[PDB]
Ligand binder design. Structure first.
Ligand SMILES: [Zn+2]
Length: 64
């Protein structure tokens, strides 16, 4: 029943709030490493990970 693909998708949103997406040039309010980000808790980052997940908002995919 554990959806690994879904859990990691949520973890990419969670990573997006906690650590960001690495790039300096990101203008996403729902994302760290962006000027528009306010420092939230990891509990709040996981809550907002689920919010952005279910609505399928602007996710920053890791593309080297
Ligand atoms: Zn970003």
């Amino acid at each position: 029943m554990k959806r690994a693909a879904a859990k990691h998708l949520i973890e990419r949103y969670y990573h997006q709030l906690t650590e960001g997406c690495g790039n300096e040039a990101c203008t996403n309010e729902f994302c760290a490493s962006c000027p528009t980000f306010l420092r939230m808790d990891n509990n709040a980052a996981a809550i907002k990970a689920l919010e952005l997940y279910k609505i399928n908002a602007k996710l920053c995919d890791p593309h080297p």
